[PDB]
Nucleic acid binder design. Structure first.
Ligand SMILES: [Mn+2]
Ligand SMILES: [Mn+2]
Ligand SMILES: [Mn+2]
Ligand SMILES: [Mn+2]
Ligand SMILES: [Mn+2]
Ligand code: NA
Length: 325
DNA sequence: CGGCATACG
DNA sequence: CGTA
DNA sequence: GCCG
């Protein structure tokens, strides 16, 4: 089992769901305390279990697995022996974890803001609503729409949204294309948001496109919130006899960059961090959602496909549905 | 021990 | 600071 | 927290 998540297929569903979910609780809690290193290790350990071909039944089976040391192994051993890990359960019911999770899931609130509010004695959403001047426009939108934004987006919602975005994109720039990315491209049946990548086959024609798209969506009454090449919006999505707010991310890239943007925006987040880590540390190349740079020759790799990028990096190709690290 | 991904709004 |  |  290789040490980087981008070196192994990781399917959306797998054979160690309970074990991986426990480790991901500890990863999330490490993040809430600002320990990005411990977050990464717990995330990586969880992802290793997602990539295994069958269930872990005995501690023996962790021998040799990357990212399993004394701590993550003890977590698994307790789950295998008692069905519960005392540390995980202690985190789950802690006031700190519950409140940081509630606050950080608000659009516009990150760990640093949530932590400051926590230290001020704040604990509930109504606590935040009671002092609106302590809030950005983005946070006000996140809190007004919080209930809708907490309900999963379904694949049925996605196709309706894509037709709407395509209509606005086609008026903004005939010939421009809209590609579904994010978790839905990896096969997820639900999501917290919808992600779209927009390009045009003639290099340079995409310049200035996103403002034109947003104006047209706004004129159609579809934009509940917006604040360039990336737009983080809240869309008004029709529902039987009403509607609901949905988070939508719109991204524009020139066709030269489109494979890199597609790769980055398709995720998963851990897969992309691992891919960039692998690129730099094992291949000496610098990867982002714009391109792949050789800092010794000071040149950018040209890619026409995701397949090109995996080949450049010496990695076997993984389709999106196997990037669920 | 140092490193831990890398951008834009 | 937020966002992906 | 783990790896090299
Ligand atoms: Mn420990
Ligand atoms: Mn998404
Ligand atoms: Mn998104
Ligand atoms: Mn750019
Ligand atoms: Mn150290
Ligand atoms: Na947030």
């Amino acid at each position: 089992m290789p040490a980087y998540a981008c070196q192994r297929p990781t399917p959306l569903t797998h054979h160690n769901t309970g074990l991986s979910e426990a480790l991901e609780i500890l990863a999330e809690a490490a993040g809430f305390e600002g320990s990005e290193g411990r977050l990464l290790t717990f995330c990586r350990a969880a992802s290793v279990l997602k990539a295994l071909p069958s269930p872990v039944t005995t501690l023996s089976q962790l021998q040799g697995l990357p990212h399993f040391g004394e701590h993550s192994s003890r977590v698994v051993q307790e789950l295998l022996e008692h069905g519960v890990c005392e540390e995980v359960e202690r985190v789950r019911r802690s006031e700190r974890y519950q409140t940081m999770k509630l606050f950080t899931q608000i659009f516009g609130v990150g760990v640093k803001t949530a932590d400051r509010w926590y230290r001020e004695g704040l604990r509930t959403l109504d606590d935040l609503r009671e002092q609106p001047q302590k809030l950005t426009q983005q946070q006000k939108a996140g809190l007004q729409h919080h209930q809708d934004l907490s309900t999963p987006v379904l694949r049925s919602d996605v196709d309706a949204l894509q037709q709407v975005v395509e209509e606005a994109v086609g008026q903004a720039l005939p010939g421009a294309t809209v590609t579904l990315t994010g978790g839905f491209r990896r096969g997820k049946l639900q999501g917290h948001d919808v992600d779209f990548l927009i390009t045009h086959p003639k290099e340079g024609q995409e310049a200035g496109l996103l403002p034109r798209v947003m104006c047209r969506l706004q004129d159609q009454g579809l934009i509940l919130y917006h604040q360039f090449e990336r737009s983080f919006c809240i869309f008004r999505l029709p529902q039987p006899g009403s509607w609901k707010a949905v988070r939508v991310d719109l991204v524009v890239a020139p066709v030269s960059q489109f494979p890199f943007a597609l790769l980055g925006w398709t995720g998963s987040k851990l897969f992309q961090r691992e891919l960039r880590r692998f690129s730099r540390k094992e291949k000496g190349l610098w990867l982002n959602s714009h391109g792949l740079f050789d800092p010794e020759q000071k040149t950018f790799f040209q890619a026409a496909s995701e397949e090109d990028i995996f080949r450049h990096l010496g990695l076997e190709y993984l389709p999106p549905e196997q990037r669920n690290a």
